């Protein structure tokens, strides 16, 4: 036996030695040593001092800008409150229950924080979906006589909120649960005891299915299309040098935003197939904080991405940051 | 297609 179970918790640690506590009430210190946990306080520090001001300046910038507010760029903003809802829904907590050795929070606290925790992340990965319905739309056109406007640009927000509500409250009302995770400080989706009373074999293949193998199809097929259009248009027109320009340099952005997706949510994806499946095994603490690392980073390199490498935001920051005029 | 490239922000 590699765990110990509790009514709303599951330490991944034996307790023959009598050792282990509730995560809600003592220090977990006999899974990880203290420093370790200093150690994950010290990265949800990095994500903070990172991941706030790049997503804020983002926000801040769209306000002093007229030429940012547009229909196209409704979802840009949209991953900036999103990676804000992974930062103090989530990395500002977990900075906190770090330093206490366990989450103080209690089971509320658990689901809250897991409610915007997960939200936030949902929100962000189905906006980078809706992105590129859009930019599949606009540039591929696969639609005759079709005008991308604001009502549609609406329609995309509110898509991601309702795909990423019908993935963190299941959770609240009986669908799976929110439990606390690795080294007990965040708590997020089950995925690690097969329990029963909530359906949590259920869940996570609908949350693989809907929630990752289908906006992976979405991705590849939209960004597929549009590399395709973008080449064939320019072997047609090979005598404009900037077309050809172009395309070179949307081809590499879209093998960017292609791999930085498949490193954000894959090592999330295969460790929680493999805990998922082979269940029950001595995971450790450490071995469950890995996709995490890449999944909660996507606050920090997502707006480098998508904001920071687009050349309209990338000028009205510099514009912003150096006092107004450069 | 340049243009619809500069407004979805790709070039
Ligand atoms: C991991 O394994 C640990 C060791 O078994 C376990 O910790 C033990 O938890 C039990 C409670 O379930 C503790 O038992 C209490 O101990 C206190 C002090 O010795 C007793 O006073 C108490 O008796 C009470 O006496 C009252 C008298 O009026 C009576 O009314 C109450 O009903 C009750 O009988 C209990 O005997 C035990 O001390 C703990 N041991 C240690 C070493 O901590 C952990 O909970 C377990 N971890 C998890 C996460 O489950
Ligand atoms: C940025 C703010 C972080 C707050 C740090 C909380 C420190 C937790 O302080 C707690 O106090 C208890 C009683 O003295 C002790 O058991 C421990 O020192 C510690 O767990
Ligand atoms: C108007 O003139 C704006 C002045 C711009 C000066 C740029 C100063 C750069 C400061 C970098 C801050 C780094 C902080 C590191 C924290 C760990
Ligand atoms: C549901 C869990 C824990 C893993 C499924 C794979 C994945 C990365 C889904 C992203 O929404």
Redesign the interface.
């Known amino acids: 036996m590699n765990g110990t179970e509790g009514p709303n918790f599951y330490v991944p640690f034996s307790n023959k030695t009598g050792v282990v506590r509730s995560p809600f009430e003592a220090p977990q210190y006999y899974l990880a040593e203290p420093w370790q946990f200093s150690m994950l306080a010290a990265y949800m520090f990095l994500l903070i001092m990172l991941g706030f001001p790049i997503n804020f300046l983002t926000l801040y910038v769209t306000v002093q800008h007229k030429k940012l507010r547009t229909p196209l760029n409704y979802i840009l903003l949209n991953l900036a409150v999103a990676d804000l809802f992974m930062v103090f829904g989530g990395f500002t907590t977990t900075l906190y229950t770090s330093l206490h050795g366990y989450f103080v929070f209690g089971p509320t606290g658990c689901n809250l924080e897991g409610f915007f925790a997960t939200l936030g992340g949902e929100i962000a990965l189905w906006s980078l979906v809706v992105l590129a319905i859009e930019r599949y739309v606009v540039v591929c056109k696969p639609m005759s006589n079709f005008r991308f406007g604001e009502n549609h640009a609406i329609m995309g927000v509110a898509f991601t909120w309702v795909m990423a509500l019908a993935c963190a409250a299941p959770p609240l009302v009986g669908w799976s649960r929110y439990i606390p995770e690795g080294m007990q400080c965040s708590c997020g989706i089950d995925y690690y005891t097969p329990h029963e009373e909530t359906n949590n074999e259920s869940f996570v293949i609908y949350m693989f299915v809907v929630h990752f193998i289908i906006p992976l199809i979405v991705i590849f097929f939209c960004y597929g299309q549009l590399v395709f259009t973008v080449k064939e248009a320019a072997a047609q027109q090979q005598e404009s040098a900037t077309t050809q320009k172009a395309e070179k340099e949307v081809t590499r952005m879209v093998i960017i935003m292609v791999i930085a997706f498949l490193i954000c949510w894959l090592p999330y994806a295969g460790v929680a197939f493999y805990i998922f499946t082979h269940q029950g095994s001595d995971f450790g603490p450490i071995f469950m904080t890995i996709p995490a690392f890449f999944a909660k980073t996507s606050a920090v390199y997502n707006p480098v991405i998508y904001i920071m490498m687009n050349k309209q935001f990338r000028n009205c920051m510099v514009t912003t940051l150096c006092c107004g005029k450069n | ?2 243009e ?2 500069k ?5």
């Open positions: 297609i340049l619809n490239l407004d979805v922000g790709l070039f």
